[PDB]
Every structure is written in structure tokens, then in C-alpha cells.
Design a binder for this molecule. Structure first.
Ligand SMILES: O=C(O)CNC(=O)C(=O)O
Ligand SMILES: [Cl-]
Ligand code: NI
Ligand code: NI
Ligand code: NI
Ligand SMILES: [Zn+2]
Length: 474
């Protein structure tokens, strides 16, 4: 086993400046061109990779994990999952939810009921990409009343509907039985696991390493997106109705980004529902399937997808990050692309990478090299910044952090800010601690007159974590 990275002492000595240790100019991220080889028309409506579970033991069959994580499978539907594990989906019924926490908050998206797989402008004149979805907030009790009455009404120029989304099931004291039911899942889809990157973040990232619930009426749509930082997604349909999923492989996200732009929409932050006719003509394959109650949908890393309720149903969902080179690579790429687009990375990949280095014995050479490389780039960036401040006579205040303390982001550009926080004098005194990155601070004060610099980690500490992160035996 050959170490290809310099020691932390070597990195530090290099910053104190001769020959370079590495090329810090880095190729900047860009959306990929349409995959090669191109696909013919007869391969643009592929069947969905499926797993048909019958017994509890089937769910824990080891090859399951590998089938779902296989890059060639953009999505996997696991049929009969709830039944095989005898999960009580009743714990997630609207009735049970109302009884548990009837005043709990629900984000509401008001939309137009659209026909089938299509999206039309509000006048019904033509198909468009923009998906109208306006935000409000209500309680579970009040949305439950609406969901129930919507259904009763059905037993008896688009109509307006409301979609209960992003309902926060993070509090184990309000949702104890609900969250406990999910510990029955196999490790690779659990909300918390040693093999889940998001379990190593060290703090709560709502909806990713905590459970989110959806309450739906027919037509309730989640428009096109990739997960935050391209993390895999897990979704179980509670029922009683079905959901319909539309899926495009990760490699085509550049093509979809271009469609968005051509329709004057933002790919990452915009609200869009793809025109299937447009995709077909651009030779973009679409996986399309129905998720029944009890079925689990696994969305692979960076898979582009959008969803609509066909019936009345609830869903629960969260993210997982398999401990693989593929997942880490995609997460870092989106992290870098986000920076270029001034879009917030909900997963703080630097904070996480350093936690992975503290906690995880990485045995796979490719994944190990990616992480250690990240540690090298950021260790170097931190010491470079520290040396510049010291040379400019700017002092560094020890601030430290609590172990469960979240990563901080710039209040201006929303970039992750690691180890050295810039806070205005007023903000420091009032302990409001409004963080800025270096660049955004300097824009308002060239010499940082109006700012203090808080240090969260000892350099000795980072240096040790770096040196102690070594390829683990298989
Ligand atoms: O259930 C929905 O409407 C949307 N769900 C997802 O995007 C997901 O689970 O990844
Ligand atoms: Cl709003
Ligand atoms: Ni138990
Ligand atoms: Ni999703
Ligand atoms: Ni603090
Ligand atoms: Zn900034």
C-alpha cells in the first residue's frame, strides 16, 4: 500500500512559503453533454428495475443493496416491502397522524390538477414546463380534514388542489412509534446507519437524515429535481392510493438542465414538470412506473425524478448516502456546481468529509483517495488563509464549537464556511453570530476592519485527523 499524499507537516511547511505540492487550479464543474452512446427510440421507455419481496428474509438478502446501488439502475422499486417486513403502515395513516399531533405544521403547495402526465399553462392553451406550486402553511388537523373531504367529494379550466408536503417527522418525542417502526428496515435503507454517510454529518439535516411525510390528494405533484447533493432517496407509499413516478438517469441531467434554461427556468431551484414529448425527441430515456401502497422506491444517486399522486395517499421519505466512491463523487461534484451557481448545499460536504475521516475506516482505495484528497485541499486552504490573516496582522479568536454544532454557511452567498468564520463586530458582541465567508466579508471591508475572525477547530486537530486517515485493511 502506497501513500500518495503529503503529510500534514509537509502541507503546513508548504503554506509557510520552490516546488509545488499540488495543482490548486482545478477543472471547474459543468453540466455533462448528452450521454454516449446515444439511445435509439426503441430504448427510451425502459422497464423499471424491480425487486419482488415475499418474506422478511428476502429484504435482508445482501445482493439487494448492490442491485439498488448499481449505477446502471437509476431507480429500483421494491414490491411488497411493507408486507414482507410486516410494517404497520397504519402508524402513518392520516387518522393516526391527527391523533398523534393534530397541530403539527404542514407545508402546503397549491397547484392545478393537471391531466395525466401533462402540464399545461393555466388557460389550458399549451403544454409548458413551469409547474405552478404556491406555498402556504397549515396544521395536520386542517389538511387531514381537506384530504378526507376531497375523497368523499369524489365518491359523489383546471380545478385547484392542495398538497401537504415536507411534514417534519424528526421529533422522536412526538413520533416515537412511527420512527420506531422504521428500525425494522434493512440497514441499507434505514434513516440512521453506520453505512450511511448522512449519519456521519453529526447534526440534523431536515428531510435528509430525518423522516419527511407527504399527505396527498390526486394530482399532487413533486416537480423535477435531483436530491440535495445527489444523495440517494428512499420513499415508502403509505396508501391507500398509488403514486406515479417519472425517472431519468443521472447522466442526462445536463440535457434536462438545458431544457430548463430554454424554457426560462432554473434547473436547481426552479419548479418544472418535463414535457415527455420533448424528452422523447431528444432521446432521453424515461422510466415510468406506479408505486403502490407498501412499495419502496429507491432513487439512485443523482437520478432525476418527478412524482404525482394518482390516488389519495401519504408517503414517507428520507435520504441515504451509501459508503461508495460513486455516491461521494456525485455529492462532491454537486457541492462544487452549487458553489458556482450560488445555490446552497444542504449537505455540508467539507464538514461531513472531516467527520468521515474521524469515524470511518475506509477500505476501498478509490473512495479513500477521494476523501483524503478533499481533506488535503481544505487543510491547505485553511492554513493558507490562517497564514494570510497572521501576515496582515489580523488576529484569530478561539471560538471552538460543540460536537453537535451544525456547519455554518455564509449569510450572503450561502457557501459552507469551514473552520474560520467572519462575523461583524456588532454581530459578535450580540452573539447573533451572523457568519460570512471570506469573500463576502471583504466585499464590504477590504481589510476586514468591520469583522472578527472566529476559529472553530485547532489546526493541530485537523492535522492529526488528516494524518490518521489511512486506507483500512479489507
Ligand atoms: O413523494 C413525492 O411526491 C416526492 N418524493 C420524492 O421526490 C422522493 O422521495 O425522492
Ligand atoms: Cl411564501
Ligand atoms: Ni422493537
Ligand atoms: Ni426526490
Ligand atoms: Ni458557538
Ligand atoms: Zn459568502
Amino acid at each position: 500500500s502506497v501513500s500518495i499524499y503529503p503529510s500534514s507537516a509537509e502541507v503546513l511547511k508548504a503554506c509557510r512559503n520552490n516546488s509545488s505540492i499540488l495543482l490548486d487550479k482545478c477543472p471547474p464543474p459543468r453540466p455533462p453533454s448528452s450521454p454516449y452512446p446515444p439511445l435509439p427510440k426503441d430504448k427510451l421507455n425502459p422497464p423499471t428495475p424491480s425487486i419482488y419481496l415475499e418474506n422478511k428474509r428476502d429484504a435482508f438478502f445482501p445482493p439487494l443493496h448492490q442491485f439498488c446501488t448499481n449505477p446502471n439502475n437509476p431507480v429500483t422499486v421494491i414490491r411488497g416491502l411493507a408486507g414482507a417486513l410486516k410494517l404497520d403502515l397504519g402508524l402513518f395513516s392520516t387518522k393516526t397522524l391527527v391523533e398523534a399531533n393534530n397541530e403539527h405544521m404542514v407545508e402546503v403547495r397549491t397547484q392545478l390538477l393537471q391531466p395525466a402526465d401533462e402540464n399545461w399553462d393555466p388557460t389550458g392553451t399549451k403544454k409548458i414546463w413551469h409547474c405552478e406550486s404556491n406555498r402556504s402553511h397549515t396544521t395536520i388537523a386542517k389538511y387531514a380534514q381537506y384530504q378526507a373531504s376531497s375523497f368523499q367529494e369524489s365518491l359523489r379550466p383546471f380545478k385547484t388542489i392542495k398538497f401537504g408536503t415536507n411534514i417534519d417527522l424528526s421529533d422522536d418525542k412526538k413520533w416515537k412509534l412511527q420512527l420506531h417502526e422504521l428500525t425494522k428496515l434493512p440497514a441499507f435503507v434505514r434513516v440512521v446507519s453506520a453505512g450511511n454517510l448522512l449519519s456521519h454529518v453529526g447534526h440534523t439535516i431536515l428531510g435528509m437524515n430525518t423522516v419527511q411525510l407527504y399527505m396527498k390528494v390526486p394530482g399532487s405533484r413533486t416537480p423535477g429535481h435531483q436530491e440535495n447533493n445527489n444523495f440517494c432517496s428512499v420513499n415508502i407509499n403509505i396508501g391507500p392510493g398509488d403514486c406515479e413516478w417519472f425517472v431519468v438517469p443521472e447522466g442526462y441531467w445536463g440535457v434536462l438542465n438545458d431544457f430548463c434554461e430554454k424554457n426560462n427556468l432554473n434547473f436547481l431551484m426552479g419548479s418544472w414538470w418535463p414535457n415527455l414529448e420533448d424528452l422523447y425527441e431528444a432521446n432521453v430515456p424515461v422510466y415510468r412506473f406506479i408505486q403502490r401502497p407498501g412499495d419502496l422506491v429507491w432513487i439512485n444517486a443523482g437520478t432525476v425524478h418527478w412524482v404525482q399522486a394518482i390516488g389519495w395517499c401519504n408517503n414517507i421519505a428520507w435520504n441515504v448516502g451509501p459508503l461508495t466512491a460513486c455516491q461521494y463523487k456525485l455529492a462532491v461534484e454537486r457541492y462544487e456546481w452549487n458553489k458556482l451557481q450560488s445555490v446552497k448545499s444542504i449537505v455540508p460536504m467539507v464538514h461531513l468529509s472531516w467527520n468521515m475521516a474521524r469515524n470511518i475506516k475506509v477500505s476501498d482505495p478509490k473512495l479513500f483517495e477521494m476523501i483524503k484528497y478533499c481533506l488535503l485541499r481544505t487543510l491547505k486552504q485553511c492554513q493558507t488563509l490562517r497564514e494570510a490573516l497572521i501576515a496582515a496582522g489580523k488576529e484569530i479568536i478561539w471560538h471552538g464549537r460543540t460536537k453537535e454544532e451544525p456547519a455554518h454557511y455564509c449569510s450572503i452567498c450561502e457557501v459552507e464556511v469551514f473552520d474560520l468564520l467572519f462575523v461583524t463586530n456588532e454581530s459578535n458582541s450580540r452573539k447573533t453570530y451572523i457568519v460570512h465567508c471570506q469573500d463576502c466579508a471583504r466585499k464590504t471591508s477590504g481589510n476586514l476592519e468591520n469583522f472578527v475572525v472566529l476559529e472553530q477547530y485547532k489546526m493541530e486537530d485537523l492535522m492529526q485527523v488528516y494524518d490518521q486517515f489511512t486506507l483500512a485493511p479489507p
